[PDB]
Nucleic acid binder design. Structure first.
Ligand SMILES: [Mg+2]
Ligand SMILES: [Zn+2]
Ligand SMILES: [Zn+2]
Length: 164
DNA sequence: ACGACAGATAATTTGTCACTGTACACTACGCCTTTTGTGGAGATGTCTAATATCTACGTTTTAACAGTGGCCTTATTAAATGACTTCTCAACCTTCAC
């Protein structure tokens, strides 16, 4: 062993509005974990691959968030802030993006999936629901490694000027 | 007396020559034995490199398959089908109609 070392893992700081799908994707990339791997590591199994698609029948339970809060050092109350608050309706399929936010903070925001959200009040821009250059839909936020459209390679920060 | 002068005289050798005894008569280096150092085969003993044989050293290659790992969405309501469960399985009397 390395003497006086504590068993450790690569951590990531969650951004102020980062979605759980985006967060788990970064944590998985930081540790080169497959989606099945993190679920086995937390012991919740295939559930992680389901959450990364925003498939929330059922929602992330107290048990499973506290389980993920054992391998991720982020506490379960902060993990619950990566999800819609109680009774806020959300949509999983059309993945959406502000772009002007992504130039400031490279994360998907869970509020971009709310059924009540359509503009960024900070930027006063209509949030995108597909790539404005090539019309390809955005991939699940767990897969936003490159920070660009997977088809035409336009960076999300440039898509800010193609909004509203 | 003895012996001592010059010369006699009985030896001594030098030289002749008639006589005779003998070889020439072909007939020894030759017959035979032993040793002996040199020499010619010719049976026999001497003793190796080497071209294998003759397995093993074990070492690669295969394929079979075993184990790890990723993925796989989840809910409601209706229908069909197959099943399960539960419940039930009175009876005598009155009244008004020919
Ligand atoms: Mg839709
Ligand atoms: Zn914005
Ligand atoms: Zn594009």
């Amino acid at each position: 062993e390395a003497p006086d070392v504590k068993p450790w893992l690569f951590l990531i700081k969650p951004y102020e509005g980062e979605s759980l799908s985006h967060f788990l994707g970064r944590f998985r990339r930081a540790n080169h974990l497959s989606a099945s791997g993190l679920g086995t590591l937390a012991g919740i199994g295939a559930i992680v691959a389901r959450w990364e698609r925003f498939h929330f029948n059922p929602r992330p339970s107290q048990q499973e968030l506290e389980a993920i809060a054992s391998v991720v050092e982020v506490d379960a109350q902060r993990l619950a802030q990566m999800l819609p608050p109680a009774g806020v309706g959300m949509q999983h399929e059309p993945i959406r993006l502000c772009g002007a936010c992504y130039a400031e903070s490279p994360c998907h925001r869970i509020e971009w999936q709310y059924k009540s959200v359509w503009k960024c009040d900070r930027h006063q821009l209509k949030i995108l629901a597909k790539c404005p250059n090539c019309q390809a839909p955005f991939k699940m936020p767990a897969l936003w490694e490159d920070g660009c459209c997977h088809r035409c390679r336009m960076p999300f920060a440039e898509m800010a000027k193609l909004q509203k």
